[PDB]
Every structure is written in structure tokens, then in C-alpha cells.
């Protein structure tokens, strides 16, 4: 018997492969490079638990930030009304509110929380926030702090302690109390809220929602028998609210390997003969009291940069890539901020261009965390053309000459918040 | 349990209420990691040219992979963008915060340039001790060739360019390590046995020669389905994407 | 309600009976709109020569394709006769009568000429501010390149040149945006994220060289199930296809 | 075990895609970019309705047509039996008794009521329409007007009042009433009736079947202490009996980009050295009264046009594509027609050709919705070879030599009903 099968053909779509997307509910045919062709699944037992990566459970363990001290006998600073500590409210925590580990010519280590690593894995977030505080105190230290949750705010421009009263906060007594917990609200005008990091140029990035601030309502008090610096650990959890919505480009990347290429088409240096480079002063900026980069002693020899691209940013400061220089120099405590640079001898991280004409020049900033922030906001003053007068505290100063540079060196543009 | 901690707790107002994970206005939940590390990712990328082969190219392989779950040990250059701007997967990133892991692995072998036949095989007794891949003519013998009795599947590129299989765990202990040192003398038994699913192989099994542009290899990889993240060490400390591109130059 | 406001009504003869839609005559009835919208129709199209590409195409994408339900702003120019006589298709004319939507979209992009492979994206959290795709070389390095844990699909064009997927819905809020503008400053976040389903980027992945007619891409795209249109405000004005190229020459 | 399976293969048809055309009643398969690999929705609540896009729901609601004037003191149109308003009936409304805005160079923009914007997606359509007429008035105002719905005709050429009520009518009385509907009938010999807009080249199109027409029984009276003249506002919904047959190539386009590429083959203009070209008189033409372009201010310099194509249609007037220029012009109200252009002046949009012997001239036209009726019918006027004599009263007065062009002017061929 060879009976025929006529029954009519179906129209199939041929593809390559199965979902790539896909990752739960559902099934993935496949060719198992095993014996057994059947469902299989290595084996298990007590010895080996089930899988960790229930992420409430990940994202409630509790991540250190940036630590800062509380001195009792500072009568400037331990007064009532006092911004202690402040930061914009984001599962990611602030680049500078959190432990860094800087190295020339490779990318900064950041110590992030395990909130701020899974939420870099996702495009949106919501929920409450748990901030522990833990103070280093013994039962003779005392105050009071009011701290506040301010919603559709992002920095301290307008900020008070008389302001933040004014919104949901909570306030804590240190007597005899080390360890308090914070539980931060999520006031927002919409349901989910994008991430502030995302990826390569700002990729997908956005702004944090809110802010926290810490304000001295009664100031810290110690005696003569007991240290009188008070040192605070802020840490920080997802609250038993917290929840994640959408799988993009990690913002991170793992610190196995910390090298960079920067792009060549960005980088920029010195032009022919006005190079080696070392730091120094002239009288046509500021009577030589202020840092910048000279090729000679003769004056008005003042090392020149090369062509530089139009497609680079007018608020944009620069990074040193390859060799660089140590110079020693020295920035006095700006009004209004807690910014100043020690005098001490620091390696050239970052640069801010100065331009004069048909000639550009370039101010040299020490590779620290407060070298980067200062050289960013001289590169915004000289945006909006600030009078040359209220630059001047902004600008390291000028101390001594330094070594010179084996040879010319390399910048490449960034940018900050 | 300190880990969890939080001692005198104030709060000002009441829980936000939930979404379900996303699925109340996204059609879907996400609140396992697991699912994420489901999701494919490119686990190595090559060109091969017929330089890089032995002379004669006795139906050798191609390219000896390691197989890790937390992937290979990328190299950022200027021939490898992704790498030096996106950097490591989810995967990668996901696994480092977890100590141990005991499954398999999905991989997908995108091969393009080939008109020949491509021979794939697991060596699970044979993982490597390097996390980075071993090329053409710098394969020793021993892998170079195809060997007997290995869990294999062979696939005519004339027929579909993409290759599926699945890894098995087969390792003598309890745990295999995960983000292991290449640089390990006082545990190299953990190294060699403990750690990788043992070598994959990628080999051209035809007389056909290679294209002057060469063939290009794509290997994409995710967990399998009884794959286990174990224990939840903590997280090491990252590095930030949009630091190595700059928004300076917005468009670049 | 005074936009069906029918007063003193004057009926000379009854009503017409019913075909139900066209059901009677037809087979098939004609009551939603939204039925339409799920026939699909040119979404964009264009050819891309070597040298609209990287000099040193690393796998690098060929198209940035923003994904707007009401499609984009038609370019009318001797090179693309489609949308200079037909114009907009009936989804970007659909659209146009509406304020919101909050739905996916399905594609279909079919891409001539090439022998390599393709892969595709879906960047929900990227969506473009402008109503025109940007091609080749004029991609930044964010997205020139396969970025991870996206939701993708990687396509051989030797088992099919037709590639079929679907883009969900990601957005924070609400509603999506319907007939947004280009010139948008006064609310970007809504033009930013409230109004795109995110960008979808094509790109080859594969060494073998373009042609020197270069390929073709043709994108495209209809509603997706889980899709409404939903606010009817008023239509905008119109043209008339039929003043595009006169009927006083015929045939031309 | 690994028994064999020689179960016979089956025929299989591959093809590339899924059903391109298909949009209800089916499922279709696709690879979801997701990470749910099932059947996935996005989710809803009452913030957020279900579509509206149901057809009957859409065309009910009412759009407004072109308004018009009913002037008491019109001693001449205030009359019984006076045709105030008349126009085909079809869902897509003439474009002529629709708010337009004109554009040089560029395409027209109609403002269309749902129920046309809807219709021009599908191939057929049937049912009633509900005409609603809104009225300026107050309760001093009196009148009463005649409506009509004249199966199989398409024009007010036979029309007279003591016809019109020989077919279905409405008798309407203005005595303080400010709105009423007219619902027409359907009365076709065929179930579905064809649109009449289509696409490119007018493709697909077609005419209307029936004429709605309003007639003037007893005229409009006010009074000294009221305004004289009386608005109305047509509007037009579909009825509940409406319904549309067979999606085809939109009848329409969006108004976000405006612009048009006229095909380079059709493409007419003047002769080498016979342009710039200027608006003027001369004797040979009406003893030199009407308006035509030339080249210079000797006499028999009237600008010649160059090649033009056989395969443009006799019957065809032209539109002028490039830059353009301005003339002062009129036209005296043409006897039986409300036919008149006051003295003013006017942007060149339109021209009409003028064949003397081996020469063509060509007869300027304002851009004008009205310049573009009285064009079109002069060159169907010149297509039936009428005398000289009788097509003089549709051409444009000359009352000065206007500006010269910046250069040579191109023309692209058109056509209407």
C-alpha cells in the first residue's frame, strides 16, 4: 500500500532564528549539546541554592555614600540653619556623592550602590527611597537635624532651612542615637521616571525629579573629654515600594578593565614649536598671578592650541589622554561654596581654553574631583562672556614654574551637569 | 540582618502604590534579573582572514572560545567600538555581583562571508584558563581539529547562517566560580576546572576559500534555563558609559 | 452635544436600509478606522551607497529610523515620486484627527541588494526630537552601534530578505503625543519622551561589500492590536492628491 | 532508545511575509521586541479610552462648508424664486463651496469635514446626509426658503424653483429660527456610489449623483433698526444610514508639508530673448482692452511661448511654478453668472494660451479661486473654436502696464471639471 497525500501544502515564512529579545514565558527550541535529548536541567540540592536575582531583594541592601565630618567647634559652620548635606533624590546616586577612584588617562571607579547598579540596567524607575544615617557619636554629642524631601527641585539655588520646613520632612534627635532611617517619599507628576545616567554622549539621559537636604536645627554639641568631630554615613536602599520598568544599554560597565580610547577626531593639542609645555604666568592675565600653560620665558610665549573643531561644545572643559605634567599650585576658598584647593603639588588632569584673538591658550586644572567641577564652571563663565573680573577667583593661581612635558600633550572635550 | 538594617525609621507618607512590576501599564513584569540575563548579548565578535589560518587549513578551527558566564575580558580599541563605548553586557555586569553559579549557557554562532560548512563543539573537560579567545593558526592541535566523542552539531551555511545550541554544566563540583583572575597560581585547580563551562569550537569543514574581506563570527550569548545566579556578594565598583564618549561633541 | 447638534430636523423619506458595513454586497465590513490603520503602508524608504556609510564600517548601523505612529514629515522630491503624488499614506491621515494614542507598532523592513546580514533595535528610551531619519555616517557613535540589553532581532538575508517585528509601547506617562511638532521648545520633555516609541536602528552586520547600486531599505509599518487612537479633536486641512500631477495630461 | 521516525515529509510553500493587506479577523505572527515572549498588550485604565476611531462616531460630526450672504436690500437677488445656494451632493464636499487657502507655487489647503476627510479613504460610499443650515438672524428677520434634492442631476443648468418642487423638497420658515437639518435621501440606480475625488492624474474619479439646491419663496425681509444682511452657515454630517465601501489610495493628503513637485516634462515657458515678460495691450487683440503678456513696448512684441507638447489636453489652462509677478486687472460681471473681478491688483497664478498662426501667446490670470474658474472656462471656450466675439467677455481688462518678470516665467498644465 502507497497511498497519496494530496493534501495541500502550507505557506511557511522561513527565518534564521529564534527571538533574541524573548527572556521569560516562553519556550526556545534549540540543539542541546547533550546524550539525553529530552528536557533537560543539571541537577541540584541544599548545597546549591536557587538563583539570587529576585532584584527587591538586591536593591534592599543598603550601599555607602560619600561620608562627611560634622565638627562641633566649627563657629562658622555649626549654626542653626546650616546646609550640612544635599543631593538630588535618584535610585543611581550622584556621580560625587559617591566613593571615587580616579586614574590618568582611564575611566573613574565609582562605588555604586546596589539600587544604582540594577537601576542602570533599566530605563525607568519609581518608588520610595530608604536613606540611613549613621553617625559617629558616643552619648555625650547632641543635636538636631531636619531633613527634607523637596519635590520638582534639583539643586540648593534657592534652598533654606526656613524653605524646607515647607515640605514633607522629618527631623532627628542625636541623643544617644546613632543609626536613623529616612524613608523618602516619590512625589512626581508622572507614573514612572527616566533614569538620570544612560549611556555613550549622554545617551538617554535625563534629570533626577527631587531633592534631599540636611539642615542644623540645633547645632552639634561635644565637651573636653570627647572628640569633637562627628563624622556621618549616608546610605542608601529601595524601599519595600520600588520597582524598575525597562531593559536598556547598562549606563555601567564593570572596572576589570578601566581603558578608554577616546575618539581622534576630538583630540586636540599643541600647535608645532610651542611645545614642550610647562606651567607658568604673564602680566596680560591677571599681573601673573594665575596659572597657564607657556612653550618659553621670553614673555608673550605663551603656548598656542591647534586647530579646534567647531562641532565641540562652547561650555566644554578638557582632559588630559596620554603623558602629562606635576605643578604645583593653589586656589583660596571661593564666597558662597566650599571650594578651595590646598597648596600643594597635583598632576594636570583638565583644561579650560582661553581664547585671545586669532590665538587660543589653555589654564591648567589639577586631576582631582573639585579640579573637575571648578574647570567645568570657568569654561560656563567664559560661555556667557563673564566679566574677565569674576572668572579670576575660579582659576588656580600661580605659584611657581613647573617641570616641563617630554613633549606635546593631548586634550579630549567632556562635559558635566 | 545588617545587610537590611534600617533602625528607627521615620516616613512622612504612605508607600507609592504598586504596578505590579510594570505589568499595570506596561504589558510585562520586571522583577527578576534571571529574565534580563535571558536576553541574548554579543559575547565576542571576530574577522578571520585566510592569514590567520594554518597554510593548509585541514578543515581547522576558527576560533577556540571560553566559555564564561560572566563573559570574556573585553579589549576597547578602535577596531571594536561596542567594547569601548557600551563595554560589557548586562550579563557581565549582572554576574559580577554574585559569588558562584551552577547551569548552562545559550549561545548563537552568526558566521557571514562563509559559503562552506561550519563544525561546532563543546569540550566541557577542557576550559580554558584565560578569559580571551585563542585565534586560527595560534590553535594548538589538540583543539585545532575536531575530536571524537564531544557533544558536536555541524551546519551547512547554505542552509541558515546562524547556528543554536546549548552549553551543558559538566563540572565535577558544586559551584563553578564566577569573575575569576586569570592570574591564579595558589588555586589552579578552581581555575581550570571550576570556573569555565570548557571550550567551545568553531571550525570550516570544506574546501572553500575565504573571502579577501574574510569571514566575519558572531557569537551571542544568555543563560539557559537552569542556570543559577548563586550567591549575592557584593556589587565590585563601575565605570559610567557616557564617560567615555563625551556629550561635548553631541554627535560624533 | 453641539457637534452632533441636529435641530429641527426636515426628513423628506426614510432612512436607507442597511448593507452592515458592506457586508451584504462585500464580504467584509468597513465601520473602524482603526482596521485600516492595520493594513500596512510605506513608513520610509531610501537607498544607501557606500559612501553614505563610515569609512571603516564596523558593523556600524545604515538607518536611524524615529518611530512616529503618524509617520513622518513627507519629503516630495523628484527622487521619491510616492510621497510627492500619493503623499501621506491613510495612517498618517488617520492620525491626524487625533490628540493621543498609547499602543505599539508593527514593522516590516525589506532590505535589496545586500548579502550580508542585518540586525535591528528598538531604543525605547531614545526617541528622536526631529520628524526625519538620519542615515549612515551622520549617526552618532550612540547609536551607530549594537548597543546591549536592548530588545533586537539579527537577521541573516540569506534565509530572508524580509525582516518582521514588533515595537512596543515604553513611554513614562499617559498618552503619546499624535501630529507633534519639530519646533518645540517650550515643552521638550513632552517632544522628548512623550511622543516617539523610541528610535529603531537597521544595521548590517558583516564584511561583504555593498553594490555599486548600493541596497534598498524599505520600512514598513501599521498599528499594532494593543493600539488606540484616542482623542478626536479636529482634522487639519488638507490637499488634494489630484493636484499633485494634473489630469490634463493624462497619461505621463 | 533513539527510534527512528520515517513519518513522510510534507510539501511546504515558503514565503517571505505575512499578509500585507489584511488588518481585522486574523492573527499575525511577528517577533515581538520584548521581554515577555507571550501575548503581550500594553496596559489601560479610564485615564486612557478605548479608540475612537468608529466610523459613525467620526463622519456624524459636523464640518462647516463655504458660508454666504443674503443681503435684504437687494432689490435685484432678493426675489422669489431666486437660486441663493446650489451644489452637487456627495460625501466629499465640492472643493469650490469649501474653506480654502491658496499658496503660490505650492498646493492648495481645504478644510474638510470629517465625514469627506473619512470618505476619501474608501472607494464607495451611500446613505443620507445631514445638511444643517445655521442662520444669522434675529427674531425681526422673516423669510422662507426652498430646498431640494434633485436625483441624477449634477448642475444648476435646467434648475429653475418651479422645478425644484417637483422632486423631494423642504419648505423652511426663518420666522425666529436660526438652525435646521435637512436630511436628503439616497436615490441612485446602484447601491454604492463611487467617489468623485480619487488620486494623482485623477485617478479612479468620478461624478455625483444628485444636486441639492436652495431656492428664495418668500425673500428676506428686516427692518431700519436691524442689520440688512443675513449669514448663513452650511454644515454637513453624515446620516445615521451612512456607511463606506473599499479602502483605496487616499483622496488626501496632510497640510504639514505643503509642497509639490510638477512634473519637468510638461514644463512650458517663453521663447529665448522673448522674455522678461510684462502684463500689457495691443491692437490686434480687442483694440488692445484685455490683458496679455509681452516682451516689449514695440508693438507686435507679444511674448511667444515655446514647444509646447501634444499630449497636453486642448481643454487645459496653466498654473505659473517659479517666481511670478503682480498686474492690475478687472473684469465686468458676466451676464447669467456671478462672474466679476473688482479693480485691484493681483499676483499672477493662472494663464490661458492664445493660438495665432505658428504663434502662441499667452492671457494672464489672477490667483484667485474665482480667476481660476473664469480661466479654465475660456480655454474650454477656445477648445470649441467660439467666436472671437463671445469669449471677450471672460478675459481680464487691461488698465496698466505692470511690472516685468525677473526673468523667464514657467507654466505647468491643469485641468477641471
Same mark, same amino acid.
Given at each position: 500500500?502507497?497511498?497519496?497525500?494530496?493534501?495541500?501544502?502550507?505557506?511557511?515564512?522561513?527565518?534564521?532564528?529564534?527571538?533574541?529579545?524573548?527572556?521569560?514565558?516562553?519556550?526556545?527550541?534549540?540543539?542541546?549539546?547533550?546524550?539525553?535529548?529530552?528536557?533537560?536541567?543539571?541537577?541540584?540540592?541544599?548545597?546549591?541554592?536557587?538563583?539570587?536575582?529576585?532584584?527587591?531583594?538586591?536593591?534592599?541592601?543598603?550601599?555607602?555614600?560619600?561620608?562627611?565630618?560634622?565638627?562641633?567647634?566649627?563657629?562658622?559652620?555649626?549654626?542653626?540653619?546650616?546646609?550640612?548635606?544635599?543631593?538630588?533624590?535618584?535610585?543611581?546616586?550622584?556621580?560625587?556623592?559617591?566613593?571615587?577612584?580616579?586614574?590618568?588617562?582611564?575611566?573613574?571607579?565609582?562605588?555604586?550602590?546596589?539600587?544604582?547598579?540594577?537601576?542602570?540596567?533599566?530605563?525607568?524607575?519609581?518608588?520610595?527611597?530608604?536613606?540611613?544615617?549613621?553617625?559617629?557619636?558616643?552619648?555625650?554629642?547632641?543635636?538636631?537635624?531636619?531633613?527634607?524631601?523637596?519635590?520638582?527641585?534639583?539643586?540648593?539655588?534657592?534652598?533654606?532651612?526656613?524653605?524646607?520646613?515647607?515640605?514633607?520632612?522629618?527631623?532627628?534627635?542625636?541623643?544617644?542615637?546613632?543609626?536613623?532611617?529616612?524613608?523618602?517619599?516619590?512625589?512626581?507628576?508622572?507614573?514612572?521616571?527616566?533614569?538620570?545616567?544612560?549611556?555613550?554622549?549622554?545617551?538617554?539621559?535625563?534629570?533626577?525629579?527631587?531633592?534631599?537636604?540636611?539642615?542644623?536645627?540645633?547645632?552639634?554639641?561635644?565637651?573636653?573629654?570627647?572628640?569633637?568631630?562627628?563624622?556621618?554615613?549616608?546610605?542608601?536602599?529601595?524601599?519595600?515600594?520600588?520597582?524598575?520598568?525597562?531593559?536598556?544599554?547598562? #549606563?555601567?560597565?564593570?572596572? /576589570?578593565?578601566?581603558?578608554?580610547? +577616546?575618539?581622534? =577626531? @576630538?583630540?586636540? %593639542?599643541?600647535?608645532?614649536?610651542?611645545?614642550?609645555?610647562?606651567?607658568?604666568?604673564?602680566?596680560?592675565?591677571?599681573?601673573?598671578?594665575?596659572?597657564?600653560?607657556?612653550?618659553?620665558?621670553?614673555?608673550?610665549?605663551?603656548?598656542?592650541?591647534?586647530?579646534?573643531?567647531?562641532?565641540?561644545?562652547?561650555?566644554?572643559?578638557?582632559?588630559?589622554?596620554?603623558?602629562?605634567?606635576?605643578?604645583?599650585?593653589?586656589?583660596?576658598?571661593?564666597?558662597?561654596?566650599?571650594?578651595?584647593?590646598?597648596?600643594?603639588?597635583?598632576?594636570?588632569?583638565?583644561?579650560?581654553?582661553?581664547?585671545?584673538?586669532?590665538?587660543?591658550?589653555?589654564?591648567?586644572?589639577?586631576?582631582?574631583?573639585?579640579?573637575?567641577?571648578?574647570?567645568?564652571?570657568?569654561?560656563?563663565?567664559?560661555?556667557?562672556?563673564? #566679566?574677565?573680573?569674576?572668572? /579670576?577667583?575660579?582659576?588656580?593661581? +600661580?605659584?611657581? =614654574? @613647573?617641570?616641563? %612635558?617630554?613633549?606635546?600633550?593631548?586634550?579630549?572635550?567632556?562635559?558635566?551637569? | 540582618?545588617?545587610?537590611?538594617?534600617?533602625?528607627?525609621?521615620?516616613?512622612?507618607?504612605?508607600?507609592?502604590?504598586?504596578?505590579?512590576?510594570?505589568?499595570?501599564?506596561?504589558?510585562?513584569?520586571?522583577?527578576?534579573?534571571?529574565?534580563?540575563?535571558?536576553?541574548?548579548?554579543?559575547?565576542?565578535?571576530?574577522?578571520?582572514?585566510?592569514?590567520?589560518?594554518?597554510?593548509?587549513?585541514?578543515?581547522?578551527?576558527?576560533?577556540?572560545?571560553?566559555?564564561?558566564?560572566?563573559?570574556?575580558?573585553?579589549?576597547?580599541?578602535?577596531?571594536?567600538?561596542?567594547?569601548?563605548?557600551?563595554?560589557?553586557?548586562?550579563?557581565?555586569?549582572?554576574?559580577?555581583?554574585?559569588?558562584?553559579?551552577?547551569?548552562?549557557?545559550?549561545?548563537?554562532?552568526?558566521?557571514?562571508?562563509?559559503?562552506?560548512?561550519?563544525?561546532?563543539?563543546?569540550?566541557?573537560?577542557?576550559?580554558?584558563?584565560?578569559?580571551?579567545?585563542?585565534?586560527?593558526?595560534?590553535?594548538?592541535?589538540?583543539?585545532?581539529?575536531?575530536?571524537?566523542?564531544?557533544?558536536?552539531?555541524?551546519?551547512?551555511?547554505?542552509?541558515?547562517?546562524?547556528?543554536?545550541?546549548?552549553?551543558?554544566?559538566?563540572?565535577?563540583?558544586?559551584?563553578?566560580?564566577?569573575?575569576?583572575?586569570?592570574?591564579?597560581?595558589?588555586?589552579?585547580?578552581?581555575?581550570?576546572?571550576?570556573?569555565?563551562?570548557?571550550?567551545?569550537?568553531?571550525?570550516?569543514?570544506?574546501?572553500?576559500?575565504?573571502?579577501?574581506?574574510?569571514?566575519?563570527?558572531?557569537?551571542?550569548?544568555?543563560?539557559?534555563?537552569?542556570?543559577?545566579?548563586?550567591?549575592?556578594?557584593?556589587?565590585?565598583?563601575?565605570?559610567?558609559?557616557?564617560?567615555?564618549?563625551?556629550?561635548?561633541?553631541?554627535?560624533?
Amino acid at each position: 500500500d502507497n497511498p497519496p497525500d494530496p493534501t495541500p501544502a502550507k505557506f511557511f515564512v522561513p527565518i534564521p532564528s529564534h527571538s533574541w529579545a524573548h527572556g521569560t514565558n516562553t519556550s526556545e527550541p534549540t540543539n542541546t549539546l547533550r546524550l539525553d535529548g529530552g528536557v533537560v536541567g543539571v541537577g541540584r540540592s541544599d548545597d546549591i541554592g536557587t538563583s539570587d536575582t529576585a532584584i527587591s531583594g538586591i536593591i534592599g541592601v543598603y550601599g555607602l555614600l560619600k561620608p562627611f565630618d560634622w565638627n562641633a567647634n566649627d563657629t562658622g559652620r555649626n549654626v542653626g540653619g546650616h546646609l550640612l548635606w544635599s543631593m538630588p533624590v535618584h535610585p543611581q546616586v550622584d556621580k560625587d556623592q559617591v566613593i571615587q577612584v580616579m586614574t590618568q588617562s582611564k575611566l573613574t571607579q565609582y562605588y555604586l550602590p546596589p539600587i544604582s547598579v540594577v537601576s542602570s540596567l533599566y530605563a525607568y524607575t519609581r518608588g520610595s527611597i530608604k536613606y540611613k544615617f549613621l553617625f559617629g557619636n558616643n552619648p555625650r554629642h547632641n543635636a538636631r537635624l531636619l531633613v527634607a524631601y523637596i519635590p520638582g527641585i534639583s539643586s540648593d539655588n534657592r534652598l533654606t532651612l526656613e524653605r524646607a520646613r515647607n515640605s514633607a520632612h522629618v527631623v532627628f534627635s542625636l541623643n544617644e542615637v546613632s543609626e536613623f532611617v529616612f524613608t523618602v517619599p516619590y512625589i512626581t507628576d508622572t507614573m514612572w521616571w527616566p533614569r538620570k545616567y544612560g549611556g555613550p554622549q549622554a545617551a538617554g539621559e535625563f534629570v533626577a525629579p527631587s531633592y534631599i537636604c540636611m539642615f542644623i536645627l540645633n547645632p552639634l554639641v561635644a565637651m573636653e573629654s570627647v572628640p569633637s568631630i562627628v563624622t556621618i554615613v549616608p546610605m542608601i536602599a529601595a524601599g519595600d515600594d520600588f520597582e524598575v520598568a525597562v531593559p536598556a544599554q547598562p #549606563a555601567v560597565g564593570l572596572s /576589570r578593565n578601566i581603558d578608554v580610547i +577616546y575618539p581622534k =577626531d @576630538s583630540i586636540i %593639542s599643541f600647535k608645532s614649536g610651542y611645545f614642550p609645555v610647562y606651567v607658568g604666568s604673564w602680566h596680560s592675565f591677571f599681573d601673573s598671578t594665575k596659572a597657564i600653560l607657556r612653550y618659553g620665558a621670553v614673555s608673550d610665549h605663551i603656548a598656542q592650541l591647534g586647530n579646534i573643531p567647531a562641532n565641540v561644545n562652547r561650555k566644554a572643559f578638557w582632559i588630559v589622554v596620554g603623558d602629562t605634567i606635576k605643578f604645583k599650585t593653589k586656589l583660596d576658598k571661593i564666597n558662597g561654596t566650599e571650594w578651595f584647593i590646598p597648596e600643594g603639588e597635583y598632576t594636570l588632569g583638565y583644561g579650560v581654553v582661553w581664547r585671545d584673538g586669532a590665538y587660543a591658550y589653555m589654564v591648567p586644572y589639577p586631576l582631582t574631583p573639585l579640579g573637575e567641577k571648578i574647570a567645568q564652571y570657568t569654561a560656563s563663565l567664559l560661555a556667557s562672556n563673564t #566679566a574677565i573680573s569674576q572668572i /579670576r577667583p575660579y582659576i588656580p593661581d +600661580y605659584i611657581v =614654574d @613647573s617641570a616641563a %612635558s617630554k613633549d606635546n600633550i593631548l586634550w579630549s572635550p567632556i562635559e558635566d551637569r | 540582618m545588617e545587610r537590611t538594617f534600617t533602625p528607627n525609621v521615620m516616613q512622612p507618607t504612605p508607600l507609592l502604590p504598586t504596578t505590579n512590576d510594570g505589568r499595570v501599564t506596561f504589558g510585562e513584569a520586571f522583577n527578576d534579573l534571571k529574565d534580563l540575563a535571558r536576553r541574548y548579548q554579543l559575547y565576542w565578535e571576530g574577522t578571520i582572514l585566510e592569514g590567520n589560518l594554518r597554510a593548509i587549513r585541514r578543515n581547522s578551527a576558527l576560533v577556540q572560545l571560553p566559555l564564561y558566564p560572566h563573559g570574556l575580558r573585553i579589549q576597547p580599541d578602535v577596531n571594536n567600538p561596542i567594547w569601548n563605548i557600551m563595554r560589557d553586557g548586562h550579563i557581565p555586569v549582572i554576574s559580577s555581583g554574585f559569588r558562584y553559579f551552577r547551569g548552562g549557557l545559550r549561545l548563537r554562532i552568526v558566521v557571514e562571508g562563509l559559503n562552506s560548512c561550519v563544525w561546532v563543539q563543546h569540550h566541557p573537560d577542557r576550559p580554558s584558563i584565560f578569559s580571551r579567545p585563542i585565534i586560527g593558526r595560534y590553535i594548538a592541535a589538540k583543539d585545532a581539529y575536531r575530536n571524537h566523542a564531544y557533544a558536536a552539531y555541524v551546519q551547512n551555511m547554505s542552509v541558515n547562517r546562524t547556528i543554536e545550541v546549548e552549553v551543558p554544566f559538566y563540572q565535577p563540583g558544586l559551584y563553578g566560580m564566577l569573575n575569576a583572575s586569570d592570574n591564579n597560581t595558589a588555586n589552579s585547580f578552581d581555575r581550570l576546572r571550576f570556573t569555565g563551562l570548557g571550550d567551545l569550537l568553531i571550525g570550516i569543514e570544506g574546501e572553500q576559500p575565504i573571502p579577501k574581506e574574510g569571514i566575519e563570527i558572531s557569537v551571542y550569548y544568555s543563560i539557559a534555563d537552569d542556570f543559577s545566579f548563586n550567591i549575592f556578594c557584593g556589587f565590585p565598583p563601575m565605570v559610567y558609559c557616557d564617560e567615555t564618549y563625551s556629550a561635548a561633541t553631541p554627535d560624533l
